[PDB]
Design a protein around this ligand. Structure first.
Ligand SMILES: [Cl-]
Ligand SMILES: [Cl-]
Ligand SMILES: [Cl-]
Ligand SMILES: [Cl-]
Lengths: 321, 321, 321, 321
């Protein structure tokens, strides 16, 4: 036994679980609970069937992640989920052993996180497994899919998640008129969903225009959004490799944001929180192959909605992701 | 073995079976068969494969219910299915052992019930399992899903079930005019389905307006409906915590009900029985969070349809739930 | 082991395989191949994985049929699939043992049939299983669903199958006018599919009007159709219990049939054969409960389509059922 | 054990994997990498779970192909997938043993191919299995579906694949007018998809008009398309059995092709390559049964689209099949 062999036929069309973890863990008063800015945790449930004490053994499972990466992306390693639990990384820690009380059917594995300076360009995943052994007073679920957890970790701040891209247009700069003003395409490419990734508490990034997570060249196109306020204020839009991708902000108006709430009609305990970013206006060059330059004009409004179920008073736990 | 361990990945997205049991078991002449009002029974089939006598062992399965509750509702314990078979409860009884005749492929487990004063606010469930042992001349089905029964028990009287909410409007009281009459919202929130839960033979309850079973604060919003007749008459609408939720009945008209029948076009042996409740008119305060008061005006008609297949003459068994 | 126990949770929502067998087995010249009228056969494939000779043991499986009947119809025994392979029946025979040649992956189990005087009102099924034993140089497929065959046997003649009911109207006789002529409902109940069951080579039956296979009282409503020709001619419509159900034929026109062909547009090797029955005109009383009489007027055209794939020259085997 | 027995109930409604292999393997400079014209290869991934060296044993699996052929086509052997790995064939070779490095979760089985003079009329398949043994330091995946690979091999050249049939009409020649010109049906039969099979680097074949892969008489209707250029030029349309099927080309205009590109709107790294064949104009006789002749007029444009993901620079590997 020990080794299962199969042809690239793996149920790894499924397998990654999305887990949302606050970038910073704090109390209702806003003081840091896990040691500061970018320090957080996540209580991961472990279910147990059957009247004695059970010690559950949990371990890093780089193997399942490797199978999943090859099954999902083959040769395109630039798109692989990156192993957050790899040797030497200091993003995540967890106990290798968990005790379950005699008559309890659950236990919580406390995952600790240090998201400081994480580059969310890497599709960071924490792969875990329930360890099986003859010594142990238990068995990992026969359905290997249940005894394994491939966790796509998303830190979140007040401004991150999957924004609607409905208010953003993407036009191609065709040339320049007599006045030097850009000639642009009439038609627009609309990205219905734009993922806003955490950098720190007041900063996210998006990929430039139509670029997204499934682009092997992603990392060349990160656009930073810094929120210069808590619930309203200006936004600083920047690009660390501006010169490379010919990044240019429109200097006429400065972008701004506002956070606002609305009650649900059906469930009046459910609150819709919105992050609205106005006057996003920038230009950049997308380079599919060397010598081919497609200059895009990205412009409009970004809107993020977050549903808060107030039947949970933790706020960090109340989110309906 | 003995213990199966898994991450919150459980097929417990499925698992609860809805079982309809008459609140009172009686004969065609209407006399009580199980000891009186609120005393009833349910014959639960047990299937057997393979020419000897089989003794099937059945036991309470609080473990599977616990896994299902945590998998389905996590921390929101106010929404958990409550264990009807727990130590000391006198709602349900059943034999712990059932005999199957030599050449029979079925047996019936006779569940006995005492629904007197049951609070249907608790999502009462009876969790059972086929017990496996080396001593036994059988094996519980390998598909654990088949050897386990999580039964959501619904007592039923002539007036209970899932009513259509199509004829009920829910408007918000915005203020009061010069005459003191309420100013209400024009638009309405329509609950397409309103569950009518049994209290006794002539009484049900619904949750107030838009409140339903998935509200953690349900129990604060029970509206009682008492049928003052057998097949027609008035209805007494009340609320035991009226002062807390600012419950107010409209005193202009008194609500009434009527039971009526119609034959199906396709299957002329199928009878559609209707319970129509007219002139439901009341007000109450929904409190999502302390200090937030949303005063609703609930008004209209409730209609319950029940399909009776007359190719079964038991009437209590003839219902196509 | 030997006995699997489960609660009425069985995949027996599936399980019955429909098998079409010619009522009479004959050659291209129309001479009887299996001993005469109503004598037939069916070659049932048995698949084998893995270089030696395999003897497959097949047996009657009344157990699986019993589980399926209780799981599907519970107490309504009038709707059960009837066991064609039961002790003493002379409808079907088959070898209890089948040899598979050394390098072959298939074998054919020759089922022999005697359909003479079969009452298709009984939903006749032949239940079979691959027998497992330690002595045997094989194992019945782990998926019990694959090692078991619940065969709904349909004999077929030139005029049987599922007719379209689109051209048949079902109206209710409301009363009689001054001239004694019936007053009928304007609206009609349309049965989109009407099953024509074999009686013999030139006779089928349908259930009366809206009655079908899922009526517990089916047997009281059989309408016989006798084809008085090979490819055209009159039809004799009768009812053996005419007096009981107040059966009455309209004497104005005599019903007739015609068989006709058409080539498919897409697959020109595919032939659409049609059986058209015109001027079906009769009356009968449906009795849901004693004292309730619903007099129906059934009238119109019946059309049966049968697709013959001429890339099979057996004709009896060429049908795309 | 060794033999699994089942009734024609096999998940072989699924099972065949389509694999696209270049007819000729060559480098970016267009020089032959595998020995010349029609010589190619395919690197087939093999996935391994669990820290030692694993030797995987792979073997020809004619058994699974046989089960699949009987389950899918029964008696119609003219439609069976043909065994490319059968004794004496020189189309494919592969190692019977593959080594996996200590900490690797994948290995690549190098399939070598010689497609010279392959007749794609045969639905050539290469059936393989992971071999299981007690000696081996591994186990073939319990899901037999994962430990088995039934590979429908498609060689491809610049002009092959599934063409759109939208621009091709199929009309029936009804007779001839006074001038001898054909009288044709107004309505057309449109094949939405037309498969272009490889013959060599500059030649494909299609089946004549409406004939396709699921015709038992396919082989009588092969229409050859020879591309007399690299990216544009004329096309030579011929039929090796022209006299048998009364094949006739319209001599008025000569067919031609052109290869052209377009960038995707959404993914600008994705290139849509098109092969457009204009002025396809020919006649042939389809013979469903002897004595029945249906003369078709096939005319129009063929368009093949191929998506090239330039985030892969191998070009032969960049195709999104
Ligand atoms: Cl850490
Ligand atoms: Cl009790
Ligand atoms: Cl017989
Ligand atoms: Cl070779």
């Amino acid at each position: 036994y020990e080794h299962y062999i199969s042809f690239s036929s793996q149920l790894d069309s499924k397998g990654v679980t999305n887990i949302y973890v606050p970038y910073s863990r704090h109390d209702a008063e806003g003081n840091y609970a896990e040691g500061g800015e970018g320090r957080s945790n996540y209580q991961l449930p472990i279910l147990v069937s059957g009247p004695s004490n059970v010690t559950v053994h949990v371990a890093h499972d780089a193997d399942t992640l490797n199978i999943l990466n090859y099954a999902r992306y083959a040769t395109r390693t630039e798109l692989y989920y990156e192993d957050m639990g790899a040797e030497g990384l200091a993003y995540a820690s967890y106990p290798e052993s968990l005790q379950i009380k005699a008559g309890e059917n659950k236990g919580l594995l406390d995952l600790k996180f240090d998201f400081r300076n994480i580059d969310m360009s890497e599709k960071w995943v924490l792969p875990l497994q329930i360890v099986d052994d003859a010594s142990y007073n238990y068995v990992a679920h026969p359905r290997k899919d249940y005894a394994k957890a491939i966790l796509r970790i998303f830190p979140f701040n007040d401004y991150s998640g999957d924004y609607s891209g409905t208010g953003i247009t993407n036009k191609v700069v065709t040339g320049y008129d007599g006045d030097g003003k850009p000639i642009e395409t009439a038609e627009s490419i609309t990205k219905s969903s734009i993922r806003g990734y955490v950098i720190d508490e007041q900063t996210i990034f998006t990929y430039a225009g139509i670029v997204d997570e499934d682009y092997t060249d992603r990392r060349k196109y990160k656009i930073k959004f810094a929120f210069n306020g808590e619930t309203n204020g200006s936004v600083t839009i920047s690009c660390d490799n501006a010169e490379e991708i010919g990044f240019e902000l429109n200097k006429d108006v400065t972008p701004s944001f506002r956070i606002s709430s609305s009650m649900d009609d059906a469930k009046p305990y459910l609150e819709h929180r919105y992050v609205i970013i106005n006057n996003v206006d920038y230009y950049f060059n997308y380079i599919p192959v060397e010598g081919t330059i497609i200059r895009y004009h990205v412009k409009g409004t970004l809107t993020l909605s977050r549903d808060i179920n107030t039947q949970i008073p933790d706020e960090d736990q109340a989110i309906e992701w």
